[PDB]
Subunit: 33 residues, 3 copies
Amino acid sequence: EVEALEKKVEALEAKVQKLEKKVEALEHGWDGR
Amino acid sequence: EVEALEKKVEALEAKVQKLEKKVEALEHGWDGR
Amino acid sequence: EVEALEKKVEALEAKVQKLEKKVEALEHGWDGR
């Protein structure tokens, strides 16, 4: 498990980082969005 | 721990998938949103 | 690993909770957003 868990957590971290950026752009209205 | 960790990661994956869909709908403006 | 995994999952849970709130505010248009 622990190896599989490591991979899924790393996937999630990448996805959470991208969502934070997208949501921060939506909240601030960057680039006319 | 490892059993608890598995459950929380699975919860997070579901939540991250729903957030991606919602944010992709906000970014693309689907359905007048 | 398992200790490191616990910390990253906890970080992710906090971040996912904040994103849910922000996205729910964007979807519902709370506070004129």
